[PDB]
Structure formats: structure tokens, C-alpha cells
Amino acid sequence: GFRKMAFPSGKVEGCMVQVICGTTTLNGLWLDDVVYCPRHVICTSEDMFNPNYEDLLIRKSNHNFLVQAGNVQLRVIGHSMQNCVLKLKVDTANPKTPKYKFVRIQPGQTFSVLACYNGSPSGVYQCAMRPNFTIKGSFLNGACGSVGFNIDYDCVSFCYMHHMVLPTGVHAGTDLEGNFYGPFVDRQTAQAAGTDTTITVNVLAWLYAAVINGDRWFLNRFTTTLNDFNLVAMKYNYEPLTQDHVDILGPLSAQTGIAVLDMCASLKELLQNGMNGRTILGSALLEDEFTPFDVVRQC
Amino acid sequence: SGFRKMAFPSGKVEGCMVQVICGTTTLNGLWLDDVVYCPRHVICTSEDMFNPNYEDLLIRKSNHNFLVQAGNVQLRVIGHSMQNCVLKLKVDTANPKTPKYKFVRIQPGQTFSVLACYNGSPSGVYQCAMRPNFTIKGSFLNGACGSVGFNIDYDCVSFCYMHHMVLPTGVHAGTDLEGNFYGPFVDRQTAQAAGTDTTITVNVLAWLYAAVINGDRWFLNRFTTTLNDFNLVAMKYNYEPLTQDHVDILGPLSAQTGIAVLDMCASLKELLQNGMNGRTILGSALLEDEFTPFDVVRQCSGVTF
Ligand SMILES: Cn1cnc(Cn2c(=O)nc(Nc3cc4cn(C)nc4cc3Cl)n(Cc3cc(F)c(F)cc3F)c2=O)n1
Ligand SMILES: Cn1cnc(Cn2c(=O)nc(Nc3cc4cn(C)nc4cc3Cl)n(Cc3cc(F)c(F)cc3F)c2=O)n1
């Protein structure tokens, strides 16, 4: 089978806490004796439009931060600011702290999101960092602080912390070091995402998965060069295809016997002529939120 | 903002997954208190997979022939029993991570989260629905037999599915936690056909309501219809008949959006007869039937678990 699959969330569920600064409530990440959370928590309703975070933080004390891990209360013994992320040292180290790493992902790579509200998880889904450095997720009010992660052999690579919803409905956030993905800033102001492109290498991997799963009607009798495909791709707002992408798609080409540049020719036709109707792997669209690695792991 | 296929948090179920080995046949199991529940095909060998006599196969099995591994810890089987297609192994140690739980039998159309496990170790979680043909369209590889399906209702984990086999058509089939298969399938390596599947109508309507809640409203039309006249069109497009209970389940969503069910049915009637003409709904160019009305409430205007 082939379905959008997320990593097991257990290791991340036990690191989620609620952080309250006055009335402003959000979610936080409890790793060892430090609680990581968005620094927008130190803002009040009148500070959200244009905040001076250095001035807002200098007036705060350790006792101004309420951190709750369920019914358990944690005592803040130190506070610091790293870019757009607030770090609260606490008296107790999280016993359920997993082996972890803080990674900064690049557009096209995927991750699992644990949507949390008031420190309590609500659901898990998979989503990708769009080339415009936004993410298409499902977030409601209070989701600020929810994290995105990948798990590789019991090690959880934290890569995203949710911050804000953009006017277009897409979402924007930071890495676990506070540096935003994209040109966005933590302020309650209208910030436009930008014209998004389609992750080409991911689309091809999904087409390879369809061949592996029976759907092979899109397969044509043509081939092309990387340059002529990139010419066609640019017209339909598709990301450029590099030799790196071709080499990563090697395993998928091997299992199917379909050369990468031939799959590019099939995608070129699907773009130039259209899809008229019909479905591929359960979709009438071309999916770009499956990395080549995700496809191999599932198929 | 946004709408995605969302699964329940898997933590409570991850701590109940164990590996069960009978001689060499290896599977996954569910460790709740002092009982490990697992598919009974584990007692079959390579020559027993086609037509096994499970009563006789178990009569030749002893407690020491079942190897159950809870992570690195070894569990001692102190008793074995068979309930329908489920093997139940009493163990010496009660699972300390046993959550508050229930065993429920779901009905076709209802959804649940699946924790795909291999050799006792979870690997991924996804959401899927019990198709009207009593199969499930999932992502399972070799060794997935034993993976469980669940819903979480405020700290209570309702176990509803245990994976058994992949059917020749590529779909998947399994049982409830009392051993009774979903559908007319049997635990043996024989060619078993699923049957013609229909589209869960009430789920499609709930998904359209979810789009109204999330901004997509281009499909909302100026027409209305009756339940009977829609079911005439529904049957034509291989859709399940729409009942008054389905209408009543869509009650909450209709109020929140201000759109009557029969009006949404008329828009669906048009979407079925006319098409989607390129347009997208909630990020999809097809009509989704794997979102129950409760799933929309959970995701749209819903919170913790
Ligand atoms: C609908 N939606 C989708 N994603 C989000 C994420 N998100 C959020 O969860 N909360 C936000 N504002 C807050 C208001 C508060 C009121 N109280 C009492 N406490 C509050 C805490 C927060 Cl964080 N925002 C808005 C927002 C948050 C930021 F971190 C930021 F830099 C700019 C912003 F405009 C938000 O987007 N909601
Ligand atoms: C590709 N795929 C998708 N879903 C599945 C589920 N599934 C499975 O995981 N394993 C199965 N056969 C086994 C072989 C074994 C070899 N050893 C050493 N131990 C084994 C244990 C099992 Cl279960 N099967 C086949 C199958 C399993 C049953 F429980 C059944 F009743 C009939 C069947 F044909 C399987 O479908 N694999």
C-alpha cells in the first residue's frame, strides 16, 4: 500500500508542556532541564503587533513563567532568548527525554507534526517544507509551539516549531534555534508567503510509487534531457531538477526499470498536455510531499 | 486553518507493542496488563499456511514454544488460549504502560488510526477507514501482521482492529480484538476476494462541510433536493445510500456552517454529475470519503487527547 505516513509520536508527546506568561498561553518543548518555546509568549495583547523582545524580556523574571507538564508544575530557574525561541531552565529534568538532535531542514524534505493545544497533543500528521519556506498544516488557535520532527533509530531530529498562520492559510515557524524558515518575523502583522513552486524530485518519486503500485498509464515512450525538462518545468512553476535529484532517484529507477529522464518525459507530457481526467495512486493531482526516501521506506 | 489526514497520538499504543515468535513464525502483539493478544497465524509454519487446523496446531503447542519480547525484556508465557482468530498468551508480568482501554467493533465507514509495527517496534502511524467491503486500504509490509488500529477518547484507547493479511487485490483484512474478522475472510493463505466497494456518502458530505469551515465554498450551490432523489443519483455513482441517521450525524456540522444537509447533498449531486473542473477542495481534486463527521469536529473546532 501507499499512504501518507507520519512517525510515531510517543517520544515527542512526553516532551510537551504548557507555557503561560500572564494570560498568554502556548505550547513548549521540554528537553532535559530546558523548556523551548516561542518567544511570542512574553508578548501581551498590546505588544503583539510590534514587539521589542529585548525590552519585553528584560522586564521579565523567572517567576513570571508558568510551565505545566500536565498536572505537574515545573519551577523556572533561568531564562534566556535565542533568536525567536525562549529557553526556560527548569528545576526538574524530563525523565522521558528522548535521544534528540536539532536540525535545520531544507525545502522539499518532509517531517511529522504533533499538533498540540495547552501542552496536550491532539493529532499527528505529515507535511513538507514548501519551497516558499511555508508549511501546509492543520493548526488551530493555540497550536503555537507544536513541533515537527523526524525519527531515525530512536533519535528524534527536531526541525520545526510552529509560530504563526499566514494570511493565505499556510503556516510559518522556526527551527529549534529560533531562526525562522523564510523571511518571516514573529509579529502579528500581515506577512505574505510568496509564489510557491512544486517540488519536482518529490513528484517523480510519487510517480515511481504509482508504477510500483500498478498505476502505469502515465508512462510514455519518450525521453528528455535534464535541460529540456527544466525548461518545461519552469513554465509550469516546478522546481529545477538537479543531478543530485537524479542520483537520489536511482533506487526508484532501478526497481521499476524506468530511467529518471524517461519519467521526466512522462511528467513533461502530463504538464504540457494535461491530465484530462483520471487518477494516479488515488489522486487526480501530482503529489509533491513525498521525498524519494519516504517512497523507498514505504514501498 | 488547513485540513489534513490526522491520526491520533500514538504514544499510549506504542508502549503495548511486543514481538511474538512461535518457533520461527514471527509476529507483532498487543501487551495489555498480563495478556498478549496476537494473530493466531503465528502457530502456522510454511507448510501450514494454506489450510491450517488451528485447534490441532495449538494442541501441539506449549507455553515454552511462544517467545514474546517486550523491547529488550523477555516475558514468560504462563498460559495460552484461542478466541476465534486471536491467540491470547498470559504472561508473568503485567504491562506497566497499559493505558485505559476498550475493545470495540467498528462499523463500515468509521475511521481509526493504525500504528504499523514490525518485530515489535512501531514504524509509522496513519489514518484509514473500514471500507464498506469490510477491508482497509493501508500501507503494510511483511511483518506488519499484528499492528493494531485504535481511536482515543480522552485518555481511553479504543482498540478496534488488528491486522492479519493482505488480500490479493492489495487491500488489507483483519479482526477485532475478540478474534472476529471484519468481513467474510479467513486466516489462511488462500485467494480471497474482497468484493465491490462503495463510497461512504456521509463521510464525503462531512468533508464538504469541513471545507466550508476552512474557506473552500465554491461548491456550495443554489439548489436543494430530497434524500430519495439524491440516493437515486448516489446509487448511480457507486455511493452508499444516505439514511436519516447520516443526516442526524451531520447535524452538528450543519448548524456551525448554517448549511442544511439536503442543500449540501444537492451540491454533492452537482459535483458528482458535473465534476470538479480542475478546481480543488481542501487540497484534493477528488472527493474524499475517509473523514467521518466526528473527524471533522475533532480537527475543525477540536482539541486535546
Ligand atoms: C489559527 N491558527 C493557526 N495557527 C495558529 C498559531 N498561532 C497561535 O496559536 N497563537 C497565536 N497568537 C496567540 C494568541 C494568544 C492569546 N493568548 C491568551 N495567548 C496567546 C498566544 C498566542 Cl501565540 N498566533 C498569532 C501569532 C503568533 C506568533 F508567534 C507570531 F509571531 C505572530 C502571530 F500573529 C498564531 O499564529 N493559529
Ligand atoms: C506484505 N504484507 C502486507 N500485509 C502483510 C501482513 N502479513 C504478514 O505480515 N505476514 C504474513 N505471513 C507471515 C509470514 C511469516 C514468516 N515468518 C517467519 N513469520 C511469519 C508470520 C506471518 Cl503472519 N502474512 C500472510 C498471512 C498472514 C495471516 F495472518 C494469515 F492468516 C494468512 C496469511 F496469508 C501477511 O499477510 N504483509
Author numbering:
A (entry chain B): 2 to 300
B (entry chain A): 1 to 305
Pull text from the paper:
The main/3C-like protease (Mpro/3CLpro) of severe acute respiratory syndrome coronavirus 2 (SARS-CoV-2) is responsible for making 11 out of 14 cleavage events for liberating and activating the viral non-structural proteins essential for the virus replication, and accordingly, it is an important target for antiviral drugs (1–4). Clinically relevant SARS-CoV-2 Mpro inhibitors, including nirmatrelvir, the active component of the Food and Drug Administration-approved drug Paxlovid, and ensitrelvir, which has been approved in Japan for the treatment of coronavirus disease 2019, target the cysteine protease active site of Mpro to competitively block its catalytic activity. Multiple studies have identified an Mpro mutation (E166V) that confers strong resistance to clinically relevant inhibitors, including nirmatrelvir, but the underlying mechanism is not fully understood. Glu166 is also hydrogen-bonded with the N-terminal Ser1 of the dimer partner to stabilize the Mpro homodimer and intramolecularly with His172 to stabilize its active site.
Of the several proteins screened, Mpro with four amino acid substitutions, namely, T21I, L50F, S144A, and E166V (hereafter referred to as QM for quadruple mutant), yielded high-quality crystals, allowing for structure determination by itself and in complex with nirmatrelvir, ensitrelvir, and bofutrelvir at resolutions ranging from 1.71 to 2.33 Å. The E166V mutation abolishes a direct polar contact between Glu166 and the edge of the triazole ring. However, in contrast to the case with nirmatrelvir, the substituted valine residue does not cause a steric clash with ensitrelvir; the Val166 side chain is positioned 3.7 Å from the triazole ring of ensitrelvir for a favorable van der Waals contact, which may explain why E166V confers less drug resistance than E166A specifically against ensitrelvir. The S144A mutation in the QM also causes a loss of direct polar interaction with the triazole moiety of ensitrelvir (3.5 Å between Ser Oγ and a nitrogen atom from triazole in our Mpro E166V/L50F-ensitrelvir structure), although it does not significantly affect the positioning of the inhibitor. Overall, the structures suggest that the Mpro E166V and S144A mutations affect the binding of ensitrelvir via loss of direct polar contacts. Notably, in two of the four molecules in the asymmetric unit of the Mpro QM structure bound to ensitrelvir, the Gln189 side chain takes a bent conformation and makes a short-distance (2.1–2.2 Å) fluorine-amine hydrogen bond with the trifluorobenzyl moiety of ensitrelvir (cyan in Fig. 4B). Mpro QM showed the smallest ΔTm among all variants for all three drugs: 0.5°C for nirmatrelvir, 1.5°C for ensitrelvir, and 7.7°C for bofutrelvir, consistent with its strongest drug resistance observed in the biochemical assays above for nirmatrelvir and ensitrelvir.
